[PDB]
Design a protein around this motif. Sequence first.
Motif, mmCIF file in Angstrom:
data_model
loop_
_atom_site.group_PDB
_atom_site.id
_atom_site.type_symbol
_atom_site.label_atom_id
_atom_site.label_comp_id
_atom_site.label_asym_id
_atom_site.label_seq_id
_atom_site.Cartn_x
_atom_site.Cartn_y
_atom_site.Cartn_z
ATOM 1 N N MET E 113 -17.436 93.829 -44.517
ATOM 2 C CA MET E 113 -17.597 95.244 -44.824
ATOM 3 C C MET E 113 -18.726 95.511 -45.804
ATOM 4 O O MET E 113 -18.981 96.677 -46.119
ATOM 5 C CB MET E 113 -16.293 95.812 -45.383
ATOM 6 N N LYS E 115 -21.798 93.865 -45.133
ATOM 7 C CA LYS E 115 -22.912 93.910 -44.196
ATOM 8 C C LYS E 115 -22.850 95.128 -43.289
ATOM 9 O O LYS E 115 -23.897 95.624 -42.859
ATOM 10 C CB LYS E 115 -22.940 92.650 -43.325
ATOM 11 N N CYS E 116 -21.650 95.622 -42.994
ATOM 12 C CA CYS E 116 -21.502 96.721 -42.051
ATOM 13 C C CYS E 116 -22.233 97.960 -42.548
ATOM 14 O O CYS E 116 -22.254 98.252 -43.746
ATOM 15 C CB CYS E 116 -20.020 97.033 -41.837
ATOM 16 N N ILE E 117 -22.844 98.685 -41.614
ATOM 17 C CA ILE E 117 -23.522 99.938 -41.905
ATOM 18 C C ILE E 117 -22.731 101.133 -41.395
ATOM 19 O O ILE E 117 -23.239 102.258 -41.408
ATOM 20 C CB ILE E 117 -24.951 99.945 -41.338
ATOM 21 N N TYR E 118 -21.500 100.917 -40.937
ATOM 22 C CA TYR E 118 -20.599 101.993 -40.536
ATOM 23 C C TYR E 118 -21.288 102.928 -39.547
ATOM 24 O O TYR E 118 -21.398 104.137 -39.750
ATOM 25 C CB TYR E 118 -20.093 102.749 -41.766
#
Lengths: 342, 45, 318, 49, 176, 155
Positions: E113, E115-118
Amino acid sequence: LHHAVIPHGKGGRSSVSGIVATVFGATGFLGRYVVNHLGRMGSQVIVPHRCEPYDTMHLRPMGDLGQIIFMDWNGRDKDSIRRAVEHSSVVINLVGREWETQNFDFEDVFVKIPQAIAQVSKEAGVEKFIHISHLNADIKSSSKYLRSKAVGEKEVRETFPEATIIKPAEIFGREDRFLNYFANIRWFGGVPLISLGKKTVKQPVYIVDVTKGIINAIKDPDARGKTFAFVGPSRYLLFDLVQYVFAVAHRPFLPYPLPHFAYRWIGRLFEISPFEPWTTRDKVERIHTTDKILPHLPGLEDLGVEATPLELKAIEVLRRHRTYRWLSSEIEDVQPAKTIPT
Amino acid sequence: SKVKQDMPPVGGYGPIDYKRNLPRRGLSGYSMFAVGIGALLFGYW
Amino acid sequence: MFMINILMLIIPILLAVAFLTLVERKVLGYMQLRKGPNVVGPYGLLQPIADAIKLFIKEPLRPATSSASMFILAPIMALGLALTMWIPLPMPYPLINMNLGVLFMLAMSSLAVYSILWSGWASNSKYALIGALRAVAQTISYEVTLAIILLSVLLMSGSFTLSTLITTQEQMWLILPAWPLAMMWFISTLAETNRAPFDLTEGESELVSGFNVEYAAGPFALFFMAEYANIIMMNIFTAILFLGTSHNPHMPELYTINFTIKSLLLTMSFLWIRASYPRFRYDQLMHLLWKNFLPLTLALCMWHVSLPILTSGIPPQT
Amino acid sequence: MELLQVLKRGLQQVSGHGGLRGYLRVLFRANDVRVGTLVGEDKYGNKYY
Amino acid sequence: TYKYVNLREPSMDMKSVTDRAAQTLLWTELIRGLGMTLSYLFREPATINYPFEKGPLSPRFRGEHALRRYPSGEERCIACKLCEAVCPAQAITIEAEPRADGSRRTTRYDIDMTKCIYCGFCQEACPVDAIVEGPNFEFSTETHEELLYNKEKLLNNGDKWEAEIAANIQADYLYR
Amino acid sequence: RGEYVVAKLDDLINWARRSSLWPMTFGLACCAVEMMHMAAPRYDMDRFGVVFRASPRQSDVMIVAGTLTNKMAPALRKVYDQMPEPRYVVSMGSCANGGGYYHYSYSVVRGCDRIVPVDIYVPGCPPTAEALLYGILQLQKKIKREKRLRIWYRR
Ligand SMILES: NC(=O)C1=CN([C@@H]2O[C@H](COP(=O)(O)OP(=O)(O)OC[C@H]3O[C@@H](n4cnc5c(N)ncnc54)[C@H](OP(=O)(O)O)[C@@H]3O)[C@@H](O)[C@H]2O)C=CC1
Ligand code: SF4
Ligand code: SF4
Ligand code: SF4
């Protein structure tokens, strides 16, 4: 040392060093360098702390994700010690205090806590135990600090025979109580010294030298059951060591002799502070105690560490104590102190 | 069934204002100076 | 009973300063479609307490390059002189009844600039130095104009005693005969207090924090306390000069109530002005007070020296 | 006179919150003393207006 | 077409010149600015009373991830790894093997979460609506490790926010 | 008992610090836009007692809102070291949490926690202004739980 404890990588922060260490007293001076070196190679460090978590924050950057684990422990609680060591392969004991509190005496932190940790470590199957004694420890000293250190150094041998006991001299560094202690005497005008510092010989050692020796002892298999004496390369007179300290800081140096009994009465006055005392009767004894020459104990060179001279690494510690006039003065500006050749 | 989509109302949307509208206010320059001097004269008297 | 009188002066001033911070934060908030402090205490009535405690239990640090003695003297000098500007103020009875009260406040105001100059120079930082030299420029802009404006208003009063301004304005406020001086006095008090649109010695958008960039914790509080105590004091001075209140010797309380309200509303205007205008350039401030105010101030000084003579209305000397 | 209606709305908040204890509870717990229609309550005691 | 923004000439009739003289001396246009901020003082502030009042959102909101189930309770994910392949930040890690009953299921499903860019691509790529971004936006943590979700954390999120996730999908699946 | 009185003083100083948090005016990338919207009228962080101040020496919180690069890393640690204690760091967004979209870049620090200690992590790209405000409120409750004086008393 099963599959998960086999080294991998190239010694970086994301590598696996195979070391699972529990560092007691990691929130102090000598404990922030040990955790820093362990986490630089990718070691699993358990850091049992007694203080507020705010005071452990400087230790968090010192390791990759999940590498530094914080637990809450009590010196007199044997169950907390077991939770913090039962998964570790090496236990490092750095607990200590330069004064006595209402709750913990010198023999509570140098005789009882070290023995409690050693016993639980052996009962838990820990393989390596590293205990930090003091160089000048002996039963017949004028300081409870050193008297208790000698007793604790003996209880550890009887409890963890394969322990590696290290006996550093006075350690100088950034967050130290040796060079900063002398420099901060300038607030009181002159620098009192017992016998004018002409009868005391000190052999201070650098903090990184002590930190690299402890790390090497963990990895070196022949350090088990052997007592080491970590000392610096040069022996100084206390008058010359303090004079050099005020020379680097470019502060006026106004020494004056003070009888040993008088220096104790002054120390007794400072001990009333309910916070970190500026000086105690014990510190006066420790500062004015000649550093022992123990040729029968192996030194830093037997662990592959070259002792750092005081001159090369004294400006980094004392540049903070200079005024704007003398902040930029270079290392090569102060002549080195006078050493005591063998 | 019939296609249902986010579309404008049948008659379109009402007018939307975009031009600058800074209304004229206050008295004239002559009136303001006249009131200013009158205050001074009463104050001096 | 005089020591009690001093304490009944300085202690309320600090409380007024503490809650003027709350008033500014909420007044600006509503002028900005916000609420401001409304969580720390009912309607944010405990916000000043929290900020004061926070700053005085925070670590104060002396910069390694600082001159320690000047670094510590400056905050003391600012607050000490901030409280000293109040002792000659008739409200309606002054603590120290001075025959030359007006001149005393001018000298103390000039002396209080050095708390800015020495704080900036002692900091030994480029941003602290730049802000300090803006104080030199800003004081060169208003000091001459501010004195002659006061002189023109005292030629209708009679002397330099502040209590005598109450007698002058017993029949009528001084703002009617001297509204041109009132306008130039009001904008001169903004410059003298280092307030927007003349907040140049600090200049957050230009100099981060100006002269007090290096100060932290308690030492920073004293500069903040002095600055706000000066806003109230100068707005009290403005009310006494141009909005004189009627004095009843047997009901001195009625004076304070009316006099207190006029100072608050003048103090609110300072908050009102900070929320309405951009910031001058410190060279444009000099041209404002030397090319616009000063030519008119000299003309109005000639007029107010001739006007009493040509109407036989010279005020009494005593 | 709507100036009086403002005061009555302010007083109804005291009565609409169940007295003076309720009026102060919401004031110091949520910094808001408005009264609105109750929509429902969940199993944890949270009330929705 | 174009228009000049600052090409004007002020009238030089005496009345206009006097009007500007009054403006210069009496600060008329500086008092309009005072009037504008004075009006705002009497306007109701736009501040909501968080955390008791929350800013409005929509069913399409992209918040915290969750792994969904069928009504039967069976996991929807069949380890196709389309979400892993389309993830712009390479925030997804998947490993799979035949389950004891033979089904195609993942033994690892990790989303970093941090690294995630949503961005929502993973839920656009999933053929069985297994991975979704829920409506939760309050999951701040006190450690970097708590944001490295594994399959157990993501399934709990699904079992936690299913009552809301299923309703949001119902209100938006006809736009997808 | 004496440990009861210190606990009440510990509450007092804890209250004074979480009620007067002053973040440093420090933004780096898109996550700073959502930091402005927290100061905007809808959320109005100023009503919680949270006020931005530009000087590091007059700040209690550093919100690392945006990407941290190798060129900017030395500057970030400098302004952090210059904050007087007690000081807290709030990591906002994926870039400042673990590198985010640019985790595998040659010029991006993989997490601001490699440079400075972090107290609260706010996830999102960007976190909503209501998600950052939730993070600051979690920081306040984290300060409420500090027991410095109850640990000093027991030494
Ligand atoms: N001059 C020197 O530095 C010398 C050091 N040594 C020895 O090295 C070790 C560390 O020294 P140093 O780092 O300089 O000293 P520090 O004061 O900086 O570190 C002391 C550490 O031990 C902890 N500690 C002290 N008392 C207790 C207690 N009752 N219960 C739990 N923890 C306690 C402290 O925890 P906390 O801070 O959270 O309270 C802290 O982590 C000591 O054993 C010392 O005797 C020996 C030779 C020279
Ligand atoms: S939302 Fe985008 S960045 Fe985040 S896991 Fe899904 S595909 Fe990857
Ligand atoms: S796209 Fe859906 S089914 Fe395929 S691996 Fe990802 S979560 Fe599982
Ligand atoms: S986390 Fe997202 S919003 Fe924040 S700086 Fe990185 S890409 Fe921009």
